[PDB]
Design a protein around this ligand. Structure first.
Ligand SMILES: [Zn+2]
Ligand SMILES: [Zn+2]
Length: 215
């Protein structure tokens, strides 16, 4: 047996892939949705875990977003699966609430969370606009979409998701290549102490602090 491309997790501290639990850091924590019927009118809002808040986004024109409220979300915390209807209808593609799920050999499906009655709270999470504000990574695991924290998320910071090589077309194009296996050049995360951003180096963090907070 051989794990499939979407059987791996990524440890945000090691910055590398693992199966089941990280040899250095142990098993990741998966947060459970508050349980509610797959069918109620407001299921999505009610599936929200304690500690998070749906409310007006900090991104102009975004509408609603999801905010961290109670306490720090540790680094490498997992949410999901993203819920919705599975479909091959390309109309889903850019409908604002759908993710691509790849099945190998350039085949794809979508999980569509547009309908609040069959989706979960993750439908309200807005996409990051840049690397500095992104604090969640959407990635495929067991043919399903999960979000992991790529930062310590402090109280009052908006949850903002984006994606990379563990998702969609990039994932689909490398499928079967064992590239995750071969990774097992470490990216750096340098968070700002005064706002919700983080930077890829100390230089960039200092320039930011000096333009935005203190010089
Ligand atoms: Zn680790
Ligand atoms: Zn800042």
């Amino acid at each position: 047996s051989e794990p499939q491309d979407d059987d791996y997790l990524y440890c945000e501290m090691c910055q590398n892939f693992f199966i089941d639990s990280c040899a250095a850091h142990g098993p990741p924590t998966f947060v459970k949705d508050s349980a509610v019927d797959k069918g109620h009118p407001n299921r999505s809002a009610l599936s929200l875990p304690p500690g998070l808040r749906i409310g007006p986004s900090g991104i102009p024109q975004a509408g609603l977003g999801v905010w961290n409220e109670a306490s720090d979300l540790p680094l490498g915390l997992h949410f999901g699966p993203y819920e919705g209807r599975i479909t091959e209808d390309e109309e889903a593609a850019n409908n604002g609430y759908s993710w691509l799920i790849t099945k190998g050999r350039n085949c794809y499906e979508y999980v569509d969370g547009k309908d609040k009655s069959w989706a979960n709270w993750m439908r309200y999470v807005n996409c990051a606009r840049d690397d500095e504000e992104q604090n969640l990574v959407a990635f495929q695991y067991h043919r399903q979409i999960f979000y992991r924290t790529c930062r310590v998320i402090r109280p009052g910071c908006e949850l903002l998701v984006w994606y990379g090589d563990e998702y969609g077309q990039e994932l689909g194009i490398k499928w079967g290549s064992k590239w995750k296996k071969e990774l097992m050049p470490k990216p750096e995360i340098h968070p700002c102490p005064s706002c919700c951003l983080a930077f890829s180096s100390q230089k960039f963090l200092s320039q930011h602090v000096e333009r935005n907070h203190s010089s």
